[PDB]
């Protein structure tokens, strides 16, 4: 069975459910908490 690129990719495709919920917090803070330069 696959468990590296097919896995994870065929799981968080829409990115808007449990597991794909904490992800979105980094989508906005990633280039906001640091930036400056």
UniProtKB/Swiss-Prot annotation:
It is found in: Secreted. Residues 20-37 are annotated as: Important for receptor binding. Parathyroid hormone elevates calcium level by dissolving the salts in bone and preventing their renal excretion. Acts by binding to its receptor, PTH1R, activating G protein-coupled receptor signaling. Stimulates [1-14C]-2-deoxy-D-glucose (2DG) transport and glycogen synthesis in osteoblastic cells. Belongs to the parathyroid hormone family. Interacts with PTH1R (via N-terminal extracellular domain). This is Parathyroid hormone. It comes from Bos taurus (Bovine).
């Amino acid at each position: 069975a696959v468990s590296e690129i097919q896995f994870m990719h065929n799981l968080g495709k829409h990115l808007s459910s449990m597991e794909r919920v904490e992800w979105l917090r980094k989508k906005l803070q990633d280039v906001h908490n640091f930036v400056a330069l």
